Amino acid sequence: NVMVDGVQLPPQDIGELFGLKAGLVVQIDHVRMSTKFKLKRKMVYSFSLECIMDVGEIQNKEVILKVVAVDQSVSGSGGNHMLLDGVSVVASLPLFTGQASFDLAAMLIESNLAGSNDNFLMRNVTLDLGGFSPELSD
């Protein structure tokens, strides 16, 4: 729902972006992830598997976040056992299911919204994904 390209270049600011994030305009949120790993094997072999995640969540007022639906799509070079282990660990990781190990620190937004300044308020978030089982490749 592209509206950030119009507010990415004016910072050259980030404080205005934080103030904008501070009626309510709390709409849905779209998360994109490309998590690449190098799952190896016991025998002499190797594999590189990356998973793309498109998450349809709901923005939160102040606390963490709110999620509606998720979606997963694996890819890369890897055997059946490699992708099986990867889809097993990505569903049972310290990620969103649990403490979510979310390092927000106003850093990912600073990469998306290009900026080199901070406003002393990180306002970290935490995903609450449902727990779907996208393990239908095998």
From TrEMBL:
Highest taxon of the lineage: Viruses
Coiled coil: none
Entry's localization field: Host cell; Virion; Host cytoplasm
Similarity section: Belongs to the Bunyavirales RNA polymerase family.
Subunit comment: Homomultimer; the oligomeric structure is essential for the polymerase activity. Interacts with nucleoprotein N. Interacts with protein Z; this interaction inhibits viral transcription and replication, Z partially blocks the product exit tunnel for the releasing nascent RNA product.
Domain notes: The N-terminus contains the endonuclease activity (endoN). The central region contains the RdRp activity.
UniProt miscellaneous comment: Classified as His(-) endonuclease since it does not have a histidine upstream of the active site that coordinates the first cation. His(-) endonucleases display very low activity in vitro, although they are clearly active in vivo.
Function: RNA-dependent RNA polymerase, which is responsible for the replication and transcription of the viral RNA genome using antigenomic RNA as an intermediate. During transcription, synthesizes subgenomic RNAs and assures their capping by a cap-snatching mechanism, which involves the endonuclease activity cleaving the host capped pre-mRNAs. These short capped RNAs are then used as primers for viral transcription. The 3'-end of subgenomic mRNAs molecules are heterogeneous and not polyadenylated.
Name of this chain's protein: RNA-directed RNA polymerase L
Gene this protein is translated from: L
Residues of the full protein shown: 1916 to 2062 of 2209
